[PDB]
Amino acid sequence: KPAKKNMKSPGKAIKFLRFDWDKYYRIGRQERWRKPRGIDNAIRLELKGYQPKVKIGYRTDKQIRGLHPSGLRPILVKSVKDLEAFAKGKQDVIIIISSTIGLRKRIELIKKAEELGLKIANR
Amino acid sequence: TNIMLRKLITSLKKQDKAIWVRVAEELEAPRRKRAYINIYKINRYSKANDIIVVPGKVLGVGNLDHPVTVVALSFSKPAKEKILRSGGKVMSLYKAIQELNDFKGKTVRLMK
Amino acid sequence: YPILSIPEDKLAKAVIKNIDASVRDLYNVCKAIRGMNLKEAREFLNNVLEEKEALPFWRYSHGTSHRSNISRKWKVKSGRYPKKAIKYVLKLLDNAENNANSKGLDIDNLKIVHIAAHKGLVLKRYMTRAFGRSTRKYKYLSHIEVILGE
Amino acid sequence: MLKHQKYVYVDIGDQKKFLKVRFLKSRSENNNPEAYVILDKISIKLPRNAKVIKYEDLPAEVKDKLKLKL
Amino acid sequence: PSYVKFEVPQELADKVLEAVKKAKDSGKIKKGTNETTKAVERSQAKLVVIAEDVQPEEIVAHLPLLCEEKKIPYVYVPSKKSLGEACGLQVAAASVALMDPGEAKDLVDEIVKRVNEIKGKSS
RNA sequence: AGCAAACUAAGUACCGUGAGGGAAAGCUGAAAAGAACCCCGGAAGGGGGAGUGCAAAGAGCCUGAAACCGGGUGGUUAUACAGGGUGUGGCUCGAAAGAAGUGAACCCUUCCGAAGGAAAGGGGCGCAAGCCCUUAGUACGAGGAAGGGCGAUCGGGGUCACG
RNA sequence: GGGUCUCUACUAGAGAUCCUCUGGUAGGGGGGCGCUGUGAUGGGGUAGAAGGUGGGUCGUGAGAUCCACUGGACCCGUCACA
Incomplete structure (x- = not known):
């Protein structure tokens, strides 16, 4: 539990955006990463003042990787039958209700999860 | 890719005899290079009531004089009836692990 | 219409659509009378019609030179008399006066x-x-909108 | 979506705070409490197509469910 | 509800909530268990309001014993989420203490008198 | 896209003296209920107020992106550069989806401490800058662990100044 | 990457532990993300869908998912295939 901000809070993350994302709007509006390959490219050569390349040394600690910022394990629930298959219990999961479920089924879906003691993100 | 070949390899490795660990290593060869043996070669290099362990398939070329017990992954159907007609026996690698004499067998030969 | 601040019952609106006036001339006309009273704006625009005073140009001011009739609104001595553009703005304000009377x-x-x-x-x-x-010989039309309040 | 008026924004005391509810425009009544399904969604602005109801115009037996919230 | 001693009628619970709302708006209020406990120790609090759905229970288990030994009234409420929102918070509050109701003095003492009947026959 | 051709006339319009070459273009609504009437205008499926409809991006009619242009919000500008990333500050936005009264943020105390690691004081050597023994592997030192105080904002977004 | 072990109707997953290695063009090799359709399915979702605009969170990343508004009838998770 106390090992969640020792790796995250001090190390503000890089964005890893494609080259020339700020000169052309056709490249800047995608907001995604693409590997540099030009023979003279400067992010490929890793020159000074040029926004790091993507590397495997940037991964996160395996014991906190992929967790909800509340410290639990997120589960995306699309039906009421997904609640009955709760593993272990309410101690280690946070429920993510699907966005497309209509308002009438949501009322019954939230009631079912509340009595089980589960924690809901988008309640 | 076979479900039963994979579960057989995982249980041979757990065995505590170097004979069975070598069979599991040999069964992991590329399919194009998997081992086999014909009846004529078992006859030449064995005596009566031996135990032959083949890490592949037993095929039916040649004839058999003496009775032997042969343990193999699979048998050709013409080859299976050649062995039984001469007074021998056939087992699968699955049953050979559990057999009580095959717990502490003696005079065992590994062939290919 | 933009504004969502003044109560609705104190506003009068109008729009004039697809007229033969450029946004280059109408940028400056709309900026000079913005925030004026209706009476001051209407009589200033009529002085430009018979060239008693010049209308200033801030943005699209190529081909316009300096006048003797400019000291109020600073950085520019450059002005002109955009007659065809003024006449449409006066027509728009007539429609907006009528709507305020109603x-x-x-x-x-x-x-x-x-x-x-x-x-x-x-x-x-x-x-x-x-x-x-x-080559091209296009004709660019434009809309103009106004809101009157108290 | 709010132009169909199945969702109604409640004006809680002229504040920069509007509460969104689901209004069952059926039930044919005039002062029933079941026409209002209370969500928990405090809007910070009022959308253009939203239909607004004043807090005092609600039935008195639903005002309690909201004034505790307020 | 092990720390909960005596059942309270629901017509009384909602009067507590609207008492806190007026006390928040015209008086001094302390929110949170870490601050209500210090309120009893310094004997600066006059009302202590305890939720009935805390989990785990040892956060507010010490309040009923530490409060009655100093002769200070206390009242229960069914839910903590409503108790937190009555105080002006966007989050639940487990316990609340009132410093001086201000213009809410006229009804807090009414709460004190009514709860006596329930706790008077508790022996 | 599918045949060149899903449509007011496809080998149609249109180009060539001719053999010949060869396009573009779909979508209101369940129902026209297709906006009566009144004020403005020369007129205009033109403006304003109305009315119809579950709903008017209402005839230039499904949804309605970007480039581009106009108005406004928040920062900022006439002694001085390119442009993004970082550090320290100013002003702003912060309902939800992020943390948080079961305690945000910030202050005090104690303890452990890797690689590394002093000086002041005392004594000795050198013309001198300085060096050697002791102080002492002490003070300290990345990180890490406990307690106390105060108590409601932080993470995040926009922009400006300076390195 | 390699050695040594555990569990699972296993073309793969989930783990424990010990040793060592970490620039890269041409090029060779291993794993994954995304788009449209088909056979299935514990399977589901919808007048509240797809799409659009702005913003949260997760992942080194390709990407995934949620929130508010817009919109008015269809669309997705998993396994295999093209």
Whole structure:
């Protein structure tokens, strides 16, 4: 539990955006990463003042990787039958209700999860 | 890719005899290079009531004089009836692990 | 219409669509009378019609030179008399005065609280140049909107 | 979506705070409490197409469910 | 509800909530268990309001014993989420203490008198 | 896209003296209920107020992106550069989806401490800058662990100044 | 990457532990993300869908998912295939 901000809070993350994302709007509006390959490219050569390349040394600690910022394990629930298959219990999961479920089924879906003691993100 | 070949390899490795660990290593060869043996070669290099362990398939070329017990992954159907007609026996690698004499067998030969 | 601040019953609106006036000339006309009283704006615009004073140009001011009739609104000595553009703005303000009469507002105390010009619709024609080449002869139309308040 | 008026924004005391509810425009009544399904969604602005009801115009037997919230 | 001693009628619970709302708006209020406990120790609090749905229970288990030994009234409420929102918070509050109701003095003492009947026959 | 051709006339319009070449273009609504009437205008499926409809991006009619232009919000500008990333500050936005009264943020105390690691004081050597023994592997030192105080904002977004 | 072990109707997953290695063009090799359709399915979702605009969170990343508004009838998770 106390090992969640020792790796995250001090190390503000890089964005890893494609080259020339700020000169052309056709490249800047995608907001995604693409590997540099030009023979003279400067992010490929890793020159000074040029926004790091993507590397495997940037991964996160395996014991906190992929967790909800509340410290639990997120589960995306699309039906009421997904609640009955709760593993272990309410101690280690946070429920993510699907966005497309209509308002009438949501009322019954939230009631079912509340009595089980589960924690809901988008309640 | 076979479900039963994979579960057989995982249980041979757990065995505590170097004979069975070598069979599991040999069964992991590329399919194009998997081992086999014909009846004529078992006859030449064995005596009566031996135990032959083949890490592949037993095929039916040649004839058999003496009775032997042969343990193999699979048998050709013409080859299976050649062995039984001469007074021998056939087992699968699955049953050979559990057999009580095959717990502490003696005079065992590994062939290919 | 933009504003969502003044109560609705104190406003008068109008729009004039697809007129033969450019946003280049109408940018400066709309900026000079923005925030004026209706009476001051209407009489200033009529002085530009017979060239008693010049209307200033801040943005699209190529081909316009300096006048003797500019000291009020600073950085520019450059002005002109955009006659065809003024005449459409006066027609728009006539429509907005009428709409305020129907609501029962006081005409003597009306203020121009919003005015802006927009791009309208283009008529696409072509010219005939030398050596068998062809170019554009477009006609750009525009909208103008105004809101009057107290 | 709010132009169909199946969702109604409640004006809680002229504040920069509007509460969104689901209004069952059926039930044919005039002062029933079941026409209002209370969501928990405090809007910070009022959308253009939203239909607004004043807090005092609600039935008195639903005002309690909201004034505790307020 | 092990720390909960005596059942309270629901017509009384909602009067507590609207008492806190007026106390928040015209008086001094302390929110949170870490601050209500210090309120009893310094004997600066006059009302202590305890939720009935805390989990785990040892956060507010010490309040009923530490409060009655100093002769200070206390009242229960069914839910903590409503108790937190009555105080002006966007989050639940487990316990609340009132410093001085201000213009809410006229009804807090009414709460004190009514709860005596329930706790008077508790022996 | 599918045949060149889903449509007011496809080998149709249109181009060539001719053999010949060869386009573009779909969508209101369940129902026209297709906006009566009144004020403005020369007129205009033109403006304003109305009315119809579950709903008017209402005839230039499904949804309605970007480039581009106009108006406004928040920062900022006439002694001085390119442009993004970082550090320290100013002003702003912060309902939800992020943390948080079961305690945000910030202050005090104690303890452990990797690689590394002093000086002041005392004594000795050198013309001198300085060096050697002791102080002392002490003070300290990345990180890490406990307690106390105060108590409601932080993470995040926009922009400006300076390195 | 390699050695040594555990569990699972296993073309793969989930783990424990010990040793060592970490620039890269041409090029060779291993794993994954995304788009449209088909056979299935514990399977589901919808007048509240797809799409659009702005913003949260997760992942080194390709990407995934949620929130508010817009919109008015269809669309997705998993396994295999093209």
